[PDB]
Design an enzyme around this catalytic site. Structure first.
Site, PDB file in Angstrom:
ATOM      1  N   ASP A   1     -21.278 -27.540 -39.320  1.00  0.00           N
ATOM      2  CA  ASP A   1     -22.374 -26.703 -39.840  1.00  0.00           C
ATOM      3  C   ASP A   1     -22.561 -27.048 -41.320  1.00  0.00           C
ATOM      4  O   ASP A   1     -21.579 -26.999 -42.012  1.00  0.00           O
ATOM      5  CB  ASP A   1     -22.053 -25.236 -39.618  1.00  0.00           C
ATOM      6  CG  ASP A   1     -23.170 -24.482 -38.944  1.00  0.00           C
ATOM      7  OD1 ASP A   1     -24.253 -24.723 -39.285  1.00  0.00           O
ATOM      8  OD2 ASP A   1     -22.915 -23.687 -38.068  1.00  0.00           O
TER       9      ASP A   1
ATOM     10  N   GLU B   1     -32.170 -25.486 -38.621  1.00  0.00           N
ATOM     11  CA  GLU B   1     -32.376 -24.089 -38.212  1.00  0.00           C
ATOM     12  C   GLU B   1     -33.670 -23.585 -38.847  1.00  0.00           C
ATOM     13  O   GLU B   1     -33.740 -23.575 -40.063  1.00  0.00           O
ATOM     14  CB  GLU B   1     -31.195 -23.217 -38.586  1.00  0.00           C
ATOM     15  CG  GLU B   1     -31.223 -21.865 -37.923  1.00  0.00           C
ATOM     16  CD  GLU B   1     -30.698 -20.757 -38.811  1.00  0.00           C
ATOM     17  OE1 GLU B   1     -30.629 -20.979 -40.000  1.00  0.00           O
ATOM     18  OE2 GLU B   1     -30.347 -19.711 -38.301  1.00  0.00           O
TER      19      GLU B   1
ATOM     20  N   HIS C   1     -24.794 -18.015 -32.062  1.00  0.00           N
ATOM     21  CA  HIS C   1     -23.968 -16.976 -32.724  1.00  0.00           C
ATOM     22  C   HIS C   1     -24.830 -15.872 -33.347  1.00  0.00           C
ATOM     23  O   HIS C   1     -24.268 -14.852 -33.659  1.00  0.00           O
ATOM     24  CB  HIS C   1     -23.079 -17.613 -33.792  1.00  0.00           C
ATOM     25  CG  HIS C   1     -23.849 -18.268 -34.875  1.00  0.00           C
ATOM     26  ND1 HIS C   1     -24.593 -19.378 -34.671  1.00  0.00           N
ATOM     27  CD2 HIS C   1     -23.996 -17.967 -36.166  1.00  0.00           C
ATOM     28  CE1 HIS C   1     -25.169 -19.736 -35.787  1.00  0.00           C
ATOM     29  NE2 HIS C   1     -24.830 -18.886 -36.704  1.00  0.00           N
ATOM     30  N   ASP C   2     -26.122 -16.098 -33.572  1.00  0.00           N
ATOM     31  CA  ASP C   2     -27.036 -15.112 -34.196  1.00  0.00           C
ATOM     32  C   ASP C   2     -27.913 -14.353 -33.204  1.00  0.00           C
ATOM     33  O   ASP C   2     -28.896 -13.811 -33.644  1.00  0.00           O
ATOM     34  CB  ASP C   2     -28.025 -15.804 -35.125  1.00  0.00           C
ATOM     35  CG  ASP C   2     -27.401 -16.393 -36.361  1.00  0.00           C
ATOM     36  OD1 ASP C   2     -26.386 -15.905 -36.747  1.00  0.00           O
ATOM     37  OD2 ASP C   2     -27.967 -17.300 -36.909  1.00  0.00           O
TER      38      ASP C   2
ATOM     39  N   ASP D   1     -28.284 -25.383 -41.836  1.00  0.00           N
ATOM     40  CA  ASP D   1     -28.731 -23.972 -41.919  1.00  0.00           C
ATOM     41  C   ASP D   1     -29.996 -23.860 -42.746  1.00  0.00           C
ATOM     42  O   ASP D   1     -30.121 -24.675 -43.636  1.00  0.00           O
ATOM     43  CB  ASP D   1     -27.780 -23.095 -42.711  1.00  0.00           C
ATOM     44  CG  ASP D   1     -26.390 -23.173 -42.166  1.00  0.00           C
ATOM     45  OD1 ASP D   1     -26.130 -24.175 -41.547  1.00  0.00           O
ATOM     46  OD2 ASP D   1     -25.619 -22.239 -42.354  1.00  0.00           O
TER      47      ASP D   1
HETATM   48  O1  LIG Z   1     -25.904 -18.285 -43.948  1.00  0.00           O
HETATM   49  C1  LIG Z   1     -26.640 -17.096 -43.763  1.00  0.00           C
HETATM   50  C2  LIG Z   1     -27.173 -17.050 -42.355  1.00  0.00           C
HETATM   51  O2  LIG Z   1     -27.834 -18.269 -42.136  1.00  0.00           O
HETATM   52  C3  LIG Z   1     -27.371 -19.229 -41.225  1.00  0.00           C
HETATM   53  O3  LIG Z   1     -28.468 -20.020 -40.824  1.00  0.00           O
HETATM   54  C4  LIG Z   1     -26.596 -18.710 -40.032  1.00  0.00           C
HETATM   55  O4  LIG Z   1     -27.042 -19.183 -38.787  1.00  0.00           O
HETATM   56  C5  LIG Z   1     -26.531 -17.243 -40.001  1.00  0.00           C
HETATM   57  O5  LIG Z   1     -25.551 -16.932 -39.057  1.00  0.00           O
HETATM   58  C6  LIG Z   1     -26.102 -16.779 -41.363  1.00  0.00           C
HETATM   59  O6  LIG Z   1     -25.884 -15.401 -41.328  1.00  0.00           O
END
Ligand SMILES: OC[C@H]1O[C@H](O)[C@H](O)[C@@H](O)[C@@H]1O
Ligand SMILES: [Ca+2]
Length: 572
Positions: A100, A265, A338-339, A207
């Site tokens: 990640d 993402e 996970h979200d 992310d």
């Molecule tokens: O990093 C802050 C947020 O952004 C990211 O994209 C993650 O997917 C999420 O789980 C996180 O809470």
């Protein structure tokens, strides 16, 4: 730059959540040796690529997404050599692994931030976004604008020692990096990207790939929630004036020098802007996760639930599936991560054992027939549903859940009806449903740990677990394994096929065709309702042959679709 792209285009990604996959030493926390001990199980699902969620040194405010050192590993997950071991153990079994990449923000415990906030004269002050205060009509101190953090409250935290505000789109403990500072760019490139590309990983999950670059004048966000003072600024920070500049820099300096895949993402709402990210032409990143499909049953910024509109859903599936075949871009498809809440709970029925099985196979056909790279999340293969109504709000350990519930409790002064509605919302779409430990067998805590788990194990685990589904030909797990074998064998239409929607106005059944350029064309029909619906394939395909139904070919009735029945036909 000619590349090996087929491996990421056709590959099946399995996302592992380090804290909840497998505990190997009874402390209740999942760890890298546990992952290593389950890699054979991951391979056996059909997986080509493993997506490990944040495992780096972190205070765990946002469970790994607040990083205190890119070059070190979170001690409960294991040692630094345990991480190197995992990379090798994946490689040994023919599994690729992606890490990640969290670089919009760092932890407040990252040494870069300790220096930035120390003083206004510090060499790394401008590495983060510092802004002076503003004063209202009556003389009170107020933030520079109305931006709201994604976790609630203002996006500006007041540092009293330096009399200035720092930007934090996520928690107060996740200060945002200032991407205008070239010295901070180089620090990230070296520690967060090249350090791990040099240790042999096969790529990254980038992310919040749209929000790195903020507009220089930090203007107020629009009124997305009528009459509320603070407003989420996603719409104005997304695709900033330096965003493509940064992605271009990350490609030329890192991604293009290794044989890897990059998945970002967050996607823009239009096709031409989306291609600015994923077109081969552009040499930026390979594919994007869009929030559109996940947003059909709830509106995150207003914390409101809503019924899924079948026609909007079809238009959402087509919006991104249209990249495959008609462009040089790519796309992805996923129902879990996970979200998010569990997929059978939100998109099908989880009421009974029979309904859980029938739903797991139903959604399996939906995902398996989508073009682009396919993504599964740990648990999805065995039909883990959402935590039931009897699980109280104290068990929802996620910070997003605690902050929202607390904000309702504060802003409504314990309005008990508001708390019930806030809990109902959390019971359908909280991130916690995806963080309950993986269900391995029917022993204490579904064999995830010999100790006390760090968060509650879903209490349906005696019925829903890997060991129970392994030797049952009719389980969702063996259905998933067969449908991925089917997907690879017919990749010309399933992975690379152009999608087209038929019978658009139908509100009970979704019908679409997957066509290869070779010639071959399939027709997919999904009955999303829980009552039998009349359905006649001959009105949408001259000639057709049934290949598979999610309820069993012998149970398929010509002239109808059974409740939550998905079918694949060869046509033309
Ligand atoms: O990093 C802050 C947020 O952004 C990211 O994209 C993650 O997917 C999420 O789980 C996180 O809470
Ligand atoms: Ca452990």
């Amino acid at each position: 730059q000619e590349r090996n792209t087929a491996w990421w285009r056709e590959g099946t990604v399995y996302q592992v959540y380090p804290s909840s996959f497998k505990d190997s030493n009874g402390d209740g926390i999942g760890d890298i040796p546990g992952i290593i001990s389950k890699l054979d199980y991951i391979k056996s699902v059909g997986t080509d690529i493993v997506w490990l969620s944040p495992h780096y040194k972190s205070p765990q405010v946002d469970m790994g997404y607040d990083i205190s050192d890119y070059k070190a590993i979170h001690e409960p997950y294991g040692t630094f050599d345990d991480c190197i071991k995992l990379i090798q153990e994946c490689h040994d079994r023919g599994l690729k692994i992606i890490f990640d990449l969290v670089v919009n923000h760092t932890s407040d415990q990252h040494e870069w931030f300790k220096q930035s906030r120390s003083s206004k004269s510090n060499a790394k002050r401008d590495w983060y976004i510092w802004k002076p205060a503003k004063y209202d009509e009556q003389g009170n101190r107020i933030p520079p604008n109305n931006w709201e953090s994604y976790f609630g409250g203002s996006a500006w935290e007041w540092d009293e020692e330096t009399q200035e505000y720092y930007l934090h789109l996520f928690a107060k403990e996740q200060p945002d990096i200032n991407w205008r500072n070239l010295q901070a760019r180089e620090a990230i490139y070296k520690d967060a990207i090249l350090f791990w590309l040099d240790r042999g990983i096969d790529g990254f999950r980038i992310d919040t790939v749209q929000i790195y670059s903020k507009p220089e004048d930090f203007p107020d966000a629009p009124e997305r929630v009528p009459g509320q003072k603070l407003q989420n600024p996603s719409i104005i920070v997304e695709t900033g004036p330096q965003l493509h500049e940064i992605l271009q820099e990350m490609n030329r300096k890192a991604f293009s020098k290794y044989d890897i895949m990059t998945v970002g993402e967050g996607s823009p709402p239009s096709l031409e802007k989306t291609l600015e990210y994923v077109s081969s032409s552009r040499h930026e990143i390979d594919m994007l996760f869009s929030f559109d499909f996940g947003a059909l049953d709830h509106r995150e910024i207003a914390h409101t639930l809503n019924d899924i509109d079948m026609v909007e859903m079809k238009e959402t599936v087509y919006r991104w599936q249209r990249l495959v075949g008609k462009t040089d871009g790519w796309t992805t498809f996923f129902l879990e991560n996970h979200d998010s809440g569990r997929s059978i709970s939100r998109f099908a029925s989880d009421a009974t054992p029979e309904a859980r099985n029938r739903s797991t196979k139903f959604l399996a056909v939906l995902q398996a027939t989508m073009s682009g790279t396919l993504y599964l999340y740990q648990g999805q293969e065995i039909g883990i549903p959402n935590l039931p109504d009897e699980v109280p709000i104290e068990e929802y350990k996620d910070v997003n859940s605690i902050n929202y519930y607390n904000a309702v409790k504060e802003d409504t002064k314990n309005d008990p009806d508001a708390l019930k509605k806030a809990k109902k919302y959390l019971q359908k779409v909280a991130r916690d449903h995806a963080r309950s430990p993986m269900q391995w067998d029917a022993s204490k805590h579904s064999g995830f740990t010999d100790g006390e788990p760090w968060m509650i194990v879903n209490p349906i685990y005696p019925e829903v677990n890997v060991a129970a589904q392994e030797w049952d030909a009719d389980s969702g797990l063996n259905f998933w394994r067969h449908i991925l074998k089917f997907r690879r064998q017919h990749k010309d239409v399933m992975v690379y096929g152009t999608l087209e929607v038929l019978d658009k106005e139908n509100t009970k059944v979704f019908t679409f065709t997957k066509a290869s350029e070779s010639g071959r064309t399939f027709l997919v029909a999904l009955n999303f309702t829980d009552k039998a619906v009349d359905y006649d394939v001959d009105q949408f395909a001259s000639k057709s042959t049934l290949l598979l139904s999610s309820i069993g070919n012998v149970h398929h009735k010509s002239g109808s679709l059974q409740p939550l029945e998905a079918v694949i036909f060869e046509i033309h």
